[PDB]
From Swiss-Prot:
Induction, per UniProt: In response to exposure to reactive oxygen species (ROS) and upon entry into stationary phase.
Note: Present with 31400 molecules/cell in log phase SD medium. It is unclear whether the long polypeptide observed in mitochondria represents the immature form of the protein before cleavage of the transit peptide and release of the short form into the cytoplasm or whether two mature isoforms exists.
Keywords: Cytoplasm, Disulfide bond, Electron transport, Glutathionylation, Mitochondrion, Oxidoreductase, Phosphoprotein, Redox-active center, Transferase, Transit peptide, Transport
Gene source species: Saccharomyces cerevisiae (strain ATCC 204508 / S288c)
Full protein stretch here: 36 to 143 of 143
Modified residues (Phosphoserine): 2, 56
Lineage: Eukaryota, Fungi, Dikarya, Ascomycota, Saccharomycotina
The protein's Enzyme Commission number: 1.11.1.9, 2.5.1.18
Cysteines joined through disulfide linkages: 26-29
Name used for this protein in its record: Glutaredoxin-2
Length: 108
């Protein structure tokens, strides 16, 4: 993956306060999105969700994402331009109480 693609994906990542790279027919992508938007009431106007398998450039976005973080799996979550991880990481932070404070400024 090119440095220009890498830079573009970083730009995508930091546009909105919540970023999720997901795919359709992905059980834990669904779980992640439900946690964020249905359980925790994150305003969708403050989020960018990419469905990579719907995007003609979906495959290179994912490669760029792996380059940036080393994560190969979806969902891939960033909050405030900072890498959260996948559904397992999100769930850890949810149970920790850390997620609520992480999201605090999204409700700002």
């Amino acid at each position: 993956v090119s440095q220009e693609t890498v830079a573009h994906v970083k730009d995508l990542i930091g546009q909105k306060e919540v970023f999720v790279a997901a795919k359709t027919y992905c059980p834990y992508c669904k779980a992640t999105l439900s946690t964020l938007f249905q359980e925790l009431n994150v305003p969708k106007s403050k989020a960018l969700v990419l469905e990579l398998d719907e995007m003609s450039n979906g495959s290179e976005i994912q490669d760029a994402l792996e380059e940036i973080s080393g994560q190969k799996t979806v969902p891939n979550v960033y909050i405030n331009g900072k890498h959260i991880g996948g559904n397992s990481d999100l769930e850890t932070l949810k149970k920790n109480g850390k997620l609520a404070e992480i999201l605090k400024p999204v409700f700002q």
